[PDB]
Design a protein around this nucleic acid. Sequence first.
RNA 1: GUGAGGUUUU
RNA 2: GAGCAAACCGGAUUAGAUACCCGGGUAGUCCACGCCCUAAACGAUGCGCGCUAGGUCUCUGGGUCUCCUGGGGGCCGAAGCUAA
RNA 3: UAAACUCCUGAACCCGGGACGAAACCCCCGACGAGGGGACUGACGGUACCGGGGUAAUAGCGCCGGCCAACUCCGUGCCAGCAGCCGCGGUAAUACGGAGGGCGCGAGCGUUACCCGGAUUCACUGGGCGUAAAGGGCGUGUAGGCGGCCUGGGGCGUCCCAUGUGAA
Lengths: 208, 124, 150, 138, 99
Amino acid sequence: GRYIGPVCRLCRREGVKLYLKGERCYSPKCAMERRPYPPGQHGQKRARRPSDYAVRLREKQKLRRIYGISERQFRNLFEEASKKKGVTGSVFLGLLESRLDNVVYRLGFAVSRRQARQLVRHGHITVNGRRVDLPSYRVRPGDEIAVAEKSRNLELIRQNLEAMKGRKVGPWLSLDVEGMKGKFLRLPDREDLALPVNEQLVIEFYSR
Amino acid sequence: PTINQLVRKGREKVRKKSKVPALKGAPFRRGVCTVVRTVTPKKPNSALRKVAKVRLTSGYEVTAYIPGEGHNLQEHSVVLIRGGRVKDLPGVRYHIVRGVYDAAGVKDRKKSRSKYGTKKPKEA
Amino acid sequence: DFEEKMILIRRTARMQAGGRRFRFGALVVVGDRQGRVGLGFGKAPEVPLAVQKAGYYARRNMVEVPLQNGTIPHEIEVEFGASKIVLKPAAPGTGVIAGAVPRAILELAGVTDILTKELGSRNPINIAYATMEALRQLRTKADVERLRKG
Amino acid sequence: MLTDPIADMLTRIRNATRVYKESTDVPASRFKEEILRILAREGFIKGYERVDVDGKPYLRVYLKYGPRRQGPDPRPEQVIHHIRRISKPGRRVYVGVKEIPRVRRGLGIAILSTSKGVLTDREARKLGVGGELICEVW
Amino acid sequence: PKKVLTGVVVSDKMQKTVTVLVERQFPHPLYGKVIKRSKKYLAHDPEEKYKLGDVVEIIESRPISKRKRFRVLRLVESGRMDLVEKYLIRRQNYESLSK
RNA sequence: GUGAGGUUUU
RNA sequence: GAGCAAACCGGAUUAGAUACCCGGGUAGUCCACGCCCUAAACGAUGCGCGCUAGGUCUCUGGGUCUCCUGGGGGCCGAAGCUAA
RNA sequence: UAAACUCCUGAACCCGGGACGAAACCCCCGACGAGGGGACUGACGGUACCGGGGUAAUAGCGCCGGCCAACUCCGUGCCAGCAGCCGCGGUAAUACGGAGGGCGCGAGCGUUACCCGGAUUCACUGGGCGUAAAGGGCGUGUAGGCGGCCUGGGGCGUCCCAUGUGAA
Ligand SMILES: [Mg+2]
Ligand SMILES: [Mg+2]
Ligand SMILES: [Mg+2]
Ligand SMILES: [Mg+2]
Ligand SMILES: [Mg+2]
Ligand SMILES: [Mg+2]
Ligand SMILES: [Mg+2]
Ligand SMILES: [Mg+2]
Ligand SMILES: [Mg+2]
Ligand SMILES: [Mg+2]
Ligand SMILES: [Mg+2]
Ligand SMILES: [Mg+2]
Ligand SMILES: [Mg+2]
Ligand SMILES: [Mg+2]
Ligand SMILES: [Mg+2]
Ligand SMILES: [Mg+2]
Ligand SMILES: [Mg+2]
Ligand SMILES: [Mg+2]
Ligand SMILES: [Mg+2]
Ligand SMILES: [Mg+2]
Ligand SMILES: [Mg+2]
Ligand SMILES: [Mg+2]
Ligand SMILES: [Mg+2]
Ligand SMILES: [Mg+2]
Ligand SMILES: [Mg+2]
Ligand SMILES: [Mg+2]
Ligand SMILES: [Mg+2]
Ligand SMILES: [Mg+2]
Ligand SMILES: [Mg+2]
Ligand SMILES: [Mg+2]
Ligand SMILES: [Mg+2]
Ligand SMILES: [Mg+2]
Ligand SMILES: [Mg+2]
Ligand SMILES: [Mg+2]
Ligand SMILES: [Mg+2]
Ligand SMILES: [Mg+2]
Ligand SMILES: [Zn+2]
């Protein structure tokens, strides 16, 4: 219920290529090829410079549209992000990366956030028997995560460890492919958690 | 100024007042319109705009504006009031919410539909 | 190898007999994100000369911004006419909180975190000259220690 | 009258630094004596001594500046940028151990008045004292 | 911990009692200025030794009247009639503001 | 040392 | 109460003079009295003290009068101030 | 990629099970105390929840000249209207009504009334008084606010330490 509809529409208005479909994104058919312009019948208009409100608005979209967590679901996350003691623009990224959408997706149990959100949402992916139908769970550091025992032999999970048959994901997590589980070890940093988002011009907009 | 004058005299409060004279701090208030004669606007614009002098329940009688593409009002009509101001009229500082049982909204209205108070336009 | 972002375009006018003319004055902020920053105010009747001439007017001056922990070293209160710009330091990762013109200058000089506020007037020319006058007062600890040798 | 001779002495400082005097005078006092080893301690002014002009106890003030650098306003930059007295008679100012202002983040300094003599910001944070905030050079 | 506060005698015109105001210092809670205010604390004098124009010490006790609570314990000094003028000239400055 | 019967706003 | 001069009476001007110009002319302007409470009562700058380049024209006290030592009245002008 | 289509999970729906909240009061042994043991009780509720089977199955609101994110056509020709301000509509209206598109939020979205900040627009931090509003027409003088140098006392104001206390 966070957003239902055209999702590759947001890439053409966003600019830089976004990964939110999986098999369509990594293939050369992500609709960024041959259609660079933003949607609508205006599209390739004159090269008008976006305003300084509009640039940080599109930066709100490059922090918000990919993660999918909405705005009223997002101001509170920035609020305890500012309440934590440290660099808030670096703690906030891993703080959103402590949720069962992108912890499970960075573990690779899904091909996109719309498979991690839904397959966690039905209640399959469990935290040690305590099955969670709810991707808003804050993942503790060092949490081991496995799929359901009935979900170990589905027609979609077998296509959801296919690319990650032993993929060397970065040091903010670990995984066991032959045990079909993982372990989110510690919170990810700013740069080695490499996603196309800028840090500096975000707290400036959210403090206004 | 000086600190002794700040102790003796003291700073003053700005004492702003209510721009709308509707009593009891009311966002909305029930009223009865009397005469719906028109008022000509100010210098830059000219339009035979719709304006009804509406007496309230708090003993007042004010000058109100009718928004939208026409209206459905009579002389003994119960007109709920909103407030605000109309810029290019000399006495009007009230608006009328279309959607109350004596002020129904104007048909063919589906863009500012909740603002002008009509239900969903039924498909055919 | 600078960035050279123009931020203000003003259309001025003077009265000639029969019909008033035009003179375009832009406002170009130039920088390279490593402390070098310049300001230019041009005079040209048409727009790309108003941006280019103010560009070279931003290029023939240069002032170095000292950067301690990626940001400005100390707070300042500077009055340029009626505009009273006040800058303050911040923690790392706090944010570049500024008005329109320090939002248009400090992101060209390269300040990571700034908490500033002006008082009095709202003229962007006086906030610009108040900003370029303001950052010249920025000193580190070392250039005060080697100044104070008593 | 000389209602504020201490602010008059700080006006000798901030007035002499703008017009670039080598030496200037101030009428002597034991508290004006007590101000000056902070400035000579951190290098604001050079020294001070009890002098006598026309049978009057006075005090010399020896300013210093920077080098004559090239550019507009070729007169050298001052040690203080200025001084504003906080302890006014119209509004007395008293601070605690935690009511210590951040005097230009650690660049300038404020002079306080404690019961154990005249004492400053950093050794007020280290010693843990409090008193009447005299002035604040920055 | 009954408070022992110093006052000054400005009037003993009524028998078996003294009219004593107490000066005190407190900063303003917003502007921060040490200003001197006063408030009269009527005290009982059973010995009739404290004359007009004294500087007395005040201890609270059990009340005998409306608007009496305190009594006189001791005199610190005496004789300074100039402060009694510093009240009473304000008593003869109120008549110049009327109809 | 010297000058105005004197004007109205489209 | 000499002159001037509100109000007012006549001459020219103009559609119009009750105005600018002219002829007289009324309190008033002048003196002592008790009052009245006002302004462009202005330098459109409250009082007092201390510091901070000078040049230039005069008043005034003293000397060692060539120039200096105090105060006061104008112009330009360093730093500084102001939106100028 | 929006739709239909191949595949999957299947919210709703149905079947079965059933809770912490409850062990005390009450008796027995024991020296009527101390200590140990035994017995009754659920409105919520056949609910939250568990084990299965099982249907792809709701979406709208406000805005689009600048402030502030987002534009083409048709009709209206100072009329109908928008409107928080600047202000538009006089046959190309990017400001009106409609169609499409886009923007922001999402089971929520606009509007109203009040309060704060914005507003340093009561300035204690954080404003002025020659010309923007402002120095009383001027002086004496009451109260008050203050106040030259040096030495000594008081520790009242001021500062520091421990404690009571600032409940929940
Ligand atoms: Mg769809
Ligand atoms: Mg008009
Ligand atoms: Mg302003
Ligand atoms: Mg004319
Ligand atoms: Mg005559
Ligand atoms: Mg004068
Ligand atoms: Mg001369
Ligand atoms: Mg002379
Ligand atoms: Mg002299
Ligand atoms: Mg002179
Ligand atoms: Mg001059
Ligand atoms: Mg200058
Ligand atoms: Mg789809
Ligand atoms: Mg199928
Ligand atoms: Mg099935
Ligand atoms: Mg019972
Ligand atoms: Mg028994
Ligand atoms: Mg028992
Ligand atoms: Mg028991
Ligand atoms: Mg029952
Ligand atoms: Mg039950
Ligand atoms: Mg299906
Ligand atoms: Mg815009
Ligand atoms: Mg609009
Ligand atoms: Mg505020
Ligand atoms: Mg305020
Ligand atoms: Mg102030
Ligand atoms: Mg002002
Ligand atoms: Mg004027
Ligand atoms: Mg004025
Ligand atoms: Mg006095
Ligand atoms: Mg005194
Ligand atoms: Mg003193
Ligand atoms: Mg002593
Ligand atoms: Mg005490
Ligand atoms: Mg409490
Ligand atoms: Zn895509």
